[model samples]
Target: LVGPSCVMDDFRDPQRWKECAKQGKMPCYFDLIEENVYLTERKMQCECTPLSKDERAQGEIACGEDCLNRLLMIECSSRCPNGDYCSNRRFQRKQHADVEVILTEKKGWGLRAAKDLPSNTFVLEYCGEVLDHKEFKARVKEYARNKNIHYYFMALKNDEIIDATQKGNCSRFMNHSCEPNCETQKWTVNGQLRVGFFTTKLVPSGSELTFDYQFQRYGKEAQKCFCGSANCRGYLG
Candidate 1:
């Protein structure tokens, strides 16, 4: 499997991500040593089970909401026999064909569906440079000097962070909307963190995809939200 890219100009110039689009696909990131170490440290594991037709019809894995919330490493391919074509493997498949990064009027850069995306469609995986909590904090402090407007840091488990500020797929261009048609779900695959975006409603072609950032409120000034949604919270914090 081809691994994701190292860095792109998503932040250097908000509009550069469109021009710098790579034809290849980007997948999850993991270190062999880190994977083995985390696997050994993990106290719980879930055996993959094939979902029935009824379950597969739901569009996502049948691992149940509880299992997903716990961030368990559940793989349908482990026991389903079906490889890439498995219904539950939507997120695992390459996502470049499904999305395009574009310039938004107010959001600077945004991700849009290349075609009509049905409800519960696995849109894309959020890829980035994984770093420890200490390094993550250090970068945040350093980036502050540059007056960077886009914040692409996400919290991964074990006090680790996924910094997509420099390297990421079209998903990084997905802006925040108070009333979003997409949602983020956490999954643990082979002892690595996988954050997949899925549609919660039918998304039409050409529509800009968005999700609730649910950013934690800090005492600092909030970033003005330009989502233009009916229920906009006014701030992006």
Candidate 2:
């Protein structure tokens, strides 16, 4: 463990957290948690079960149709001469309305906190390009080209990294947080791959927004240790 011990009431002075770091260790350990709640903010949330790629595509088509129908009678002369179809056009220019980076003592390359976010709040939206696995590996190599490798990096999805990046985004700026307050999910809007993030806990103003890079990986037993949180889990990702 890499944090204050839950059993150490006498030593739970919180100050001990610093000492634990000085000694290169931690003490607290807890079981991992998960959520099954479906979000309702979006109009007509998908009621489908944990769906396969084909099923999700079908649902996205239905959802996109519903999306267009809700906006019926909009002027389509300029944007769509043939009347609008759910073409799933990419938003012009920036993927996010805003994406910025700032310094933080907690984690490197953290997403900046915007507004006062409550628990389970949808923090930020990442709508950028995604590369195939081969391209992802090449980009990582490029990112590491100028730096020394004290940290081992692996981009694995569903337990295998053989081709993880082949169909994933290559942004290495998203850092890992031991006590991450956000999580990620992939949704195909129309035929396009769309990625989204959700909050797992409350985040106040100025808090660095980050996710547990190892959430679906080797858990705490096999994770990186760079997040200097009180309950730091060992490993980087």
Candidate 3:
């Protein structure tokens, strides 16, 4: 039987959910347990059945080869590259880049690489649930024996580390680069968390998207960093 289905993509779309590699407890936001469906709810009531002929034709023209039969909608802006996927928000924001989110041949949902992105250019932005660092530390400690836990640490929300094994978004698909061209930044205004992406280097046309893991766990004072970046640091604290 299928385990808890959050938003991980199907086969033929390995890059859809990126590299999940394992299973863990999915946060409430990642699971569909909400009593009411709000416009801003994390768990939406949706299915991943195949698309119809009309849906297929439209998707192909819009999303290209990445456009499989499945159709989903998400918020977008010019900041998003062409054919990127997103959570279907229904409402469109014209000023916000490409509001029409579509999955493309490259980066998966809700995200897309820019044209000739510079080393320190802003990549994209994502807003979702946040987790408590202390809680994560306690939980992860149990699996301390699992040395292969690489991308698990990459999950972050509201400037906090998360066990997003199930509770997160398209940003989860973003891969890492040694010479990263992107970085994730946190902005605080009125005590609320806002995420931002910046360029670390000039990215050429059609380069696979990537970001530095450091920006997420930067001030972990107590924890250590094993990111293996060229400028790897022993600890953040």
Candidate 4:
């Protein structure tokens, strides 16, 4: 598959509708972004490696699993010694696995592997509107008014927040699972910190894509876990 595909809902109610991630209040615009849209000055510089093309093709690519850049969760760019030959630039190159967005029976919307994926393949970048903690706090108040709005927020290091509430890609559709087939890890893409999902194990075709959201099941904050995993913790956290 060249890119991600989406499966349509079986049927829709006459009154109900299938819109984008979150329905914006006031009927405002829905900002769609591919990479983390940086509007804050805190946007960071990559803490930026070596290999030749001929030697790389022979065996280990400089930017393969053992690459120093990858070890530090950093991606190599033209700044690296290998430059264009650097294979670690997965996010920049958008080397994502083939996935399909599926309308789940109980989970609302979710992602499914479009094809069989092997272990540890680069799935997709969690691109969204990058916001600092303060900005996130402001948005929290705005989101509180509507309980139906399921905001997608992820904690990014450097005291940052990846807010996909209004602006995001299909990556945010992934649902939570107690026993997950995927995991999201923070990485320095180009320069900014971004989360990328990778398969924890070989996922079969038509399998749902999910990872533990790490939210504690504290009181009412906990949503019932419908993951139905064998080792279900019975709660989200």
Candidate 5:
């Protein structure tokens, strides 16, 4: 005569998510990329100046907000005074806070903060295959031929685009929000422009991470927005 077990069905099934996810492995369809794959190369350089001895004073971070490179959104180069100790090299330093992808009711897949984070904290890099307008258009049409609209394209530096359809990291899971706690910022890393997501305000643990996509839907009836904010825009167009 044993008492009824209180364990959940999920705990009872050791291979529950194993169908869609592998233990300690990336079973996801898209491959994870550490950086952007450029299809073309061009000579570009940024006139960066290193921090002064005074600027890198005791306990203060080099390349602070006042750094010329910081103001210009240019990453510190190898010759930067605090080359190894630069704080504004978020792109190269990979100072990303903890984040996770979660299944949502209305949003499909969304990003979640795994821990508390401060305001303006660098979250993660938006790396993917860099394609110019030509390849971009071709890829879009190719996806459409299969009746699939890969919504993973992020418009970058004018005609340039970042398509995360086949390769990307966790940043691609971030959803669109009319009012969001995170925002995307572009920075020049070694003369190449890159995008990174940052917290716009202090975000607590288990919070949903999002940024406005500002996607235009010319003549394509607006999609209903489900942000559930106090001032919800009601439309995602």
Candidate 6:
């Protein structure tokens, strides 16, 4: 099972989601499009090339600092000459079996590290339909009226949004904490957007893997957040 409400045939296996790897139509709910089609005018300046062992040891992309500064979503699988199996492309690698989804009395549902995870480990991909401003706004408004709000919508870029309320993988079950152990990263594979959830520090087994939602706050309309972290801002937007 992927989540409390989501289930697919052999969903835990990362290979099942590979069909949507290349830029093209996805089989998920809501309309989907590949990266090239989505960023028609955005040109990638870097070419695929293998980084030296020393450079990779620093955990930096072989594509250089420009890619990181510009948040250019380059991936080793398609851009790097080393190809998909390259060690730098950790997000594309098969997921570990030490993560699990569990019910939380305070959070409803959450994803946990079933085993110890070293820092920088790629946990899971945040899969969903990409949306523009208008479409995203409409969907947010529609869901706001529901009894239980679907908090799976995430803004990928200034103008891009990923809505997973209708469909998503295990990453959707991860909740929020003021002090979180995981963080999100955006990688571009063949110009397509792939959001990955990774650990920020060593995560002990049985620990809940959370990330700050960093949801935009408007006035005092923020909802009370009970993440129970010492740094809890007392609310989540």
Best by TM-score: 5
Candidate 5: give the clashing pairs.
none
Summing lDDT over every window of 10 consecutive residues in candidate 1, give the lowest-scoring window.
Answer: 30-39
Taking all chains together, each candidate's TM-score versus the true structure is: 0.68, 0.44, 0.39, 0.78, 0.79, 0.68
Q: Write the per-residue lDDT of candidate 5 for residues 1-237, one digit (tens) a residue.
A: 011111112222335534445542222456567788876654422333455677556566666777788888888876776677677778887788877666666765667777898999899899888888898878877776665432678888876899887787777777888889999899988878899999999999888888987754333355687787887888777
**C-alpha RMSD values across all candidates:** 8.4, 16.4, 13.8, 6.3, 7.3, 8.2
Superior by TM-score: candidate 1 or candidate 2: 1
Residues 38-157 of candidate 3 have per-residue lDDT tens digits of: 223232222333455686657633332242221322223323333234222112321112111223332222233434654543344443334466656664665454432333344445
Model 4 misplaced stretches (Cα beyond 4 Å): 1-30, 43-62, 216-221
By TM-score, how accurate is candidate 3?
Answer: 0.39
The Cα local distance difference test for each model comes to 0.60, 0.40, 0.40, 0.71, 0.72, 0.63
Instruction: Indicate the residue-level lDDT of 111 in model 1.
Output: 73
Q: lDDT tens digits, residues 1-237, model 4?
A: 223234323112212223432341112223546688864866121222355566777875656776767888888776776677777889988888888776666666678887899998889888778887788778777777555435478888866788887887667778889899999988876566789899999999988889988732224466667898998887665
Per-residue alpha-carbon lDDT of candidate 1 for residues 19-61, written as tens digits (9 for 90 to 100): 4434323222212111112212333333335466776667755
Cα lDDT for residue 103, model 5?
A: 62
Instruction: Encode model 2's per-residue lDDT on 1-237: one tens digit a residue.
Output: 112222222223546645653654432221111111111112322221233468556754422333442143121121331222322222221123132344334443334554456665444334222344565456557645745332223332332232221121212235667788777654433323334455677766555566766433323244446777899757664
Model 1 clashing residue pairs (backbone): none
Poorly placed runs, candidate 1 (over 4 Å) = 1-73, 83-85, 95-97, 216-220
Which candidate comes out best when scored by lDDT?
A: 5
Clashing pairs in 4: none
TM-score of 1: 0.68
lDDT of 6: 0.63
